[PDB]
Design a protein around this nucleic acid. Structure first.
Length: 129
RNA sequence: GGGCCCGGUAAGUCUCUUCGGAGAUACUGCCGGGCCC
């Protein structure tokens, strides 16, 4: 069985970043994945990225910039309250002071830091440091 | 068998609460469609 779309996207990025590649093409291109990439971008973890129409689910061309040390999907997508992030930050960001949790809120996908800044709880979907 | 999208829902979930419920709707689920492999 194939790995879920988002997990898959984060795995490829992770590795092509490690190997030093300057680009990666992510196959399944869901709105969710795009939304997650937007967060990683706004946080300086990846460069430009674009949707490439292919008649299927689409494709994401992501510009890597050697800013990622590791990233992946969080499974299951744990629910988190407005003040329950710390517990998760210790669990997925091995490095204190570095990284973000990407959470899905009723107001959209964003970093846990913006979710807190807004008093929103949500679903954990990934980590990046 | 797998995946993408649209509309609906609001069980899970999040927020608030007079703690009865109310509001929200991204994710999961559910209903109805479109489509790709």
């Amino acid at each position: 069985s194939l790995m879920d779309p988002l997990a898959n996207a984060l795995n490829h990025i992770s590795n092509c970043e490690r190997v030093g590649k300057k680009v990666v093409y992510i196959k399944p291109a869901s709105k969710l994945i795009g939304r997650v990439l937007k967060v990683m971008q706004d946080n300086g973890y990846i460069g430009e990225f674009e949707f490439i129409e292919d008649g299927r689910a689409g494709i994401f061309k992501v510009e890597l910039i050697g800013k990622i040390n590791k990233c992946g999907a969080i499974k299951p997508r744990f629910p988190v309250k407005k003040f329950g992030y710390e517990k998760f930050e210790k669990r997925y960001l091995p490095a204190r002071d570095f990284g973000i949790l990407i959470v899905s809120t009723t107001q959209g996908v964003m970093s846990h830091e913006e979710a807190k800044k807004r008093g929103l709880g949500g679903r954990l979907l990934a980590y990046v440091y």
